[PDB]
């Protein structure tokens, strides 16, 4: 069974594929050189920075550091709106609710704490505590003001109702620990990258693995959806970034250079999807052409590994966070 | 050049900055210890002296310590070890009963080699305890250590056997120029282990202080 099927899948995958997108885009002109500058430089942390998330209004962001502190910045003036003292000093993920009233963070405590920003007393308070994962939390994303999705190190993903705190749905099938996940723009589907060098697609409502993607040979650390919603890009830890087509269920192409050996820690697109920002352990973020596989530039300037990376919802600025305890808003 | 609300927000941000700067400076004056073991090795006794992550506090000689127990994490170590490359020392425990138990010594020194020779923990000294001393004495009085160490099992006596396991265990270290291995045999818990931990931490702090100058 297993095998005969696998075969059939692979044979269909090669039969439905004739050429990739390069051939097509021989005549597409390159985007050319890209010049960017550190238009701002946020500071105040005192330890490694592991996550950051832009706000809905494209003006606020939240960063998580090992010094048990959650900070919310007004990117326009580099102020500090709030400074939440974390219960557990170990945190490796953060999330901003679309409504702008809740924030979520995880860590090695296998607990996804949810905080409230708008309070009568004017102080942030722990709205609810979430438990049920037997492994360390890895990533979390807000669906609405009541639903939350988390991926942990026990190779499981679950959708939660924060009003009750129980596992509304559980996603299983990954044989390795899940690093990161990204939700589709329509909040219908999501793709998670695990340590088994595979990506799985799931449905938010019914909850079972709609498809599966392979091609990478090592752990996948980052994943993000294309703005169109029919494609996604994943970044492994062996200096290889690949683009996949959800509808085609095939890898489109790969982004690799002979001069990079480090892994990829963060991957994100642009508003139009023409740029594919990619983090690295070489202390500098390299930007790739989504249709040319050419390094149009690098956002160098960090003294340590770049951990998190994100783009504003309006497609106007790019923010990066590194272990040097510094956040830089690029433009 | 700024309206009233912006000035008030700037003042609030300055406050928040000062509060962090104070909290961080206060938190910097304490020692963080990582705890490791092969499972049921005796870490219970050490924590007895005074979910996922487990953290304990205890103050000794006007010094606030901090111990983390990560034995409850079943995930891959490489995914999260790197988040610990700031600890002052790493406490490693091992029981002297797995030589005739199946064998677990081999796994213990395998884990010790993996942790000690890891790239992240290159400038962190390791404190290594030896649990169940009297047990071990009874075991060697019962059966020799040929099972775990067929090559040079040695004379069945406390002096030879105790030294023998030590030399092997610290032989796995390879960055002998930078890292140090502090060893100590578990006594009857007569308020002596904490003294040894304090001495080792003071030595490590002295070396770190002299490193920068």
């Amino acid at each position, epitope marked *: 069974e297993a095998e005969q099927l696998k075969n059939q899948i692979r044979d269909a995958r090669k039969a439905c594929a004739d050429a990739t997108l390069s051939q097509i885009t021989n005549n597409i002109d390159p985007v050319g050189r890209i010049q960017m500058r550190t238009r701002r430089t946020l500071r105040g942390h005192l330890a490694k920075i592991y996550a950051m998330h832009w706000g809905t209004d494209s003006r606020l962001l939240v960063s998580a550091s090992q010094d048990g502190k959650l900070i919310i910045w007004d990117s326009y003036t580099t102020n500090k709106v709030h400074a939440i003292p974390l219960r557990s000093s170990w945190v490796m993920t953060c999330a901003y609710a679309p409504s702008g009233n809740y924030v979520a963070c995880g860590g090695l405590d296998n607990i996804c704490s949810i905080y409230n920003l708008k309070t009568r007393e004017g*102080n942030v308070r722990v709205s609810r505590e979430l438990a049920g994962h037997t492994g360390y939390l890895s990533c979390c994303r807000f669906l609405d003001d009541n639903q939350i999705v988390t991926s942990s190190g026990d190779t499981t993903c679950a959708l939660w109702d924060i009003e009750t705190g129980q596992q509304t749905t559980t996603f299983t099938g990954h044989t390795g620990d899940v690093m990161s996940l990204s939700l589709a723009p329509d909040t219908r589907l999501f793709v998670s990258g695990a340590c088994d060098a595979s990506a799985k697609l799931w449905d938010v409502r019914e909850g079972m693995c709609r498809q599966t993607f392979t091609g990478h040979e090592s752990d996948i650390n980052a994943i993000c959806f294309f703005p169109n919603g029919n494609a996604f890009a994943t970044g492994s830890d062996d200096a290889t970034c690949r683009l996949f087509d959800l509808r085609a269920d095939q890898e489109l192409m790969t982004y690799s250079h002979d001069n990079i050996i480090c892994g990829i820690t963060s991957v994100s697109f642009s508003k139009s999807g023409r740029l594919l920002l990619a983090g690295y352990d070489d202390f500098n973020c390299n930007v790739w052409d989504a249709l040319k596989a050419d390094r149009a530039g690098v956002l160098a300037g960090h003294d340590n590994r770049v951990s998190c990376l994100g783009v504003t919802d309006d497609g106007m600025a790019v923010a990066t966070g590194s272990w040097d305890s510094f956040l830089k808003i690029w433009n | 050049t700024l309206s009233a*609300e912006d000035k008030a*927000a700037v003042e609030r941000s300055k406050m928040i900055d000062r509060n962090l700067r104070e909290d961080g400076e206060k938190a910097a004056r304490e020692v963080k210890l990582l705890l490791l073991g092969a499972g049921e090795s005796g870490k219970s006794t050490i924590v007895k002296q005074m979910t996922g992550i487990v953290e304990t506090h205890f103050t000794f000689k006007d010094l606030h310590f901090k111990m983390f127990d990560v034995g409850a994490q079943r995930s891959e170590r490489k995914k999260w070890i790197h988040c610990f490359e700031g600890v002052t020392a790493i406490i490693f425990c091992v029981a002297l009963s797995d030589y005739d138990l199946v064998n677990r010594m081999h796994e213990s020194m395998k884990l010790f080699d993996s942790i000690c020779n890891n790239k992240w923990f290159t400038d962190t000294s390791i404190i290594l305890f030896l649990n169940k001393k009297d047990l071990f004495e009874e075991k060697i009085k019962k059966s020799p250590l040929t099972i775990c160490y067929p090559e040079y099992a040695g004379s069945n006596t406390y002096e030879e056997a105790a030294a023998y396991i030590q030399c092997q265990f610290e032989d796995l270290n390879k960055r002998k120029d930078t890292k140090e291995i502090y060893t100590h045999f578990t006594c009857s818990t007569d308020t002596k282990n904490v003294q040894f931990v304090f001495d080792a931490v003071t030595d490590v702090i002295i070396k770190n202080n002299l490193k920068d100058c």
Partner: single-chain antibody
Amino acid sequence: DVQLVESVQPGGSRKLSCSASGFAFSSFGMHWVRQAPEKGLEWVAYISSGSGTIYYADTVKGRFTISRDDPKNTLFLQMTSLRSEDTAMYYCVRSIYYYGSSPFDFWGQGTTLTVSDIVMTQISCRSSKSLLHSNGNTYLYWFLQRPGQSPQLLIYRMSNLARFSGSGSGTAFTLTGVYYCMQHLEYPLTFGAGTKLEL
């Protein structure tokens, strides 16, 4: 639940204490508003969070002193050398300032007592200087004082709601009890004339 509790021959001195409970008193800026018995309200004093900046109305400059007891969660408004033009009712008003915050969102029950400088004339009320800063923020607050208790904030920045609506532009603001419209550009605040709605 959040609430504020606060409790003279001419030329004397008096001490006014405002008691706060049910919220983080240390993180709020405390103001002080004097409500005239029949002549509206006027700004008097304000003490930033952390006992930093302090501002007084130029009428009672120097002769009035204000202070906060942060450990005791009290605000002290000490009055020295009172005059005849001081008989009025006083209000305890709190405020918190950050991006998207809501200043003047709560008011004290009020305690009675008996013994530059833009125009804020007065539904729509006008102004003397256009309150449109270069940052895109237009500072104007709409206040309603129903008869019987303290006023409450209705609309701030004429766009944010604390069925009510508000709009306008520079020097021309409108909103679509006695209604008060407030300015916040410059340190000395100025209250509206106060328009009475009845029947």
